[PDB]
Design a protein around this ligand. Structure first.
Ligand SMILES: CC(=O)c1cccc(NS(=O)(=O)c2ccc(C(=O)Nc3nc(-c4cccc(F)c4)cs3)cc2)c1
Length: 190
């Protein structure tokens, strides 16, 4: 249930940091491009977790074992509660500039549609990497594409889309985007 989505989320973080999907595609194309796929060490990097329910918490404790600094926001949870599972809660506007990675684990609500958009992408560190394994639309897909084309977002991992399967292929086809056909709950155990 929740663990299958959390596990996919953590797998997406790893794939963004080390470009494994892109590296595998390169190898199967007969190339050996070690320089192109220089990646990111996760230890010491900051992961922003938006939404601190069950799945957000599971992602947090897994990624803490990699030495990631886990910060986040959830308007239902108090900072004292989030501290108990190791997530430093800050106001959203303080979160954007600090994150190397951002992952969303909110319900899809009016307040969370387009949570990442043109405004908040601009508040991020240049080169932020974004994961959406929750619900399509939490990350504004048009804004995400603009951030990818500018370099403001260095990479994105999407398990979900506003339309499934997506009809607009701009995100899926982007070289810095990794994607899955909504596999979040696709394990035999789940
Ligand atoms: C563990 C504990 O003692 C405790 C204490 C109180 C309640 C619970 N219950 S819970 O843990 O199951 C749970 C359930 C729901 C939610 C939740 O609805 N979160 C949402 N976030 C946004 C959100 C909007 C904008 C930006 C953004 F980043 C996030 C919208 S709604 C969060 C946690 C548990």
């Amino acid at each position: 249930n929740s663990l299958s989505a959390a596990e996919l989320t953590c797998g997406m973080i790893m794939c963004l940091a080390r470009q494994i999907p892109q590296a595998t595609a390169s190898m199967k194309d007969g190339k050996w491009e070690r320089k192109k796929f220089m990646g990111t060490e996760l230890n010491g990097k900051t992961l922003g977790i938006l939404g601190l329910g069950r799945i957000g918490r599971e992602v947090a404790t897994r990624m803490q074992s990699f030495g990631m600094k886990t910060i986040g926001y959830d308007p239902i949870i108090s900072p004292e509660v989030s501290a108990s599972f190791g997530v430093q809660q800050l106001p959203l506007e303080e979160i954007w500039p600090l994150c190397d990675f951002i992952t969303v684990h909110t319900p899809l609500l009016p307040s969370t549609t387009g949570l990442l958009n043109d405004n908040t992408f601009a508040q991020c560190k240049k080169g932020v990497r974004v994961v959406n394994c929750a619900r399509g639309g939490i990350v504004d897909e048009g804004a995400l594409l603009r951030a990818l084309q500018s370099g403001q977002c260095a990479g994105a991992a999407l398990d979900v889309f506003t339309e499934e399967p997506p009809r607009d292929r701009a995100l899926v086809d982007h070289e810095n985007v990794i994607s899955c056909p909504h596999l979040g709950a696709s394990t035999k155990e789940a």
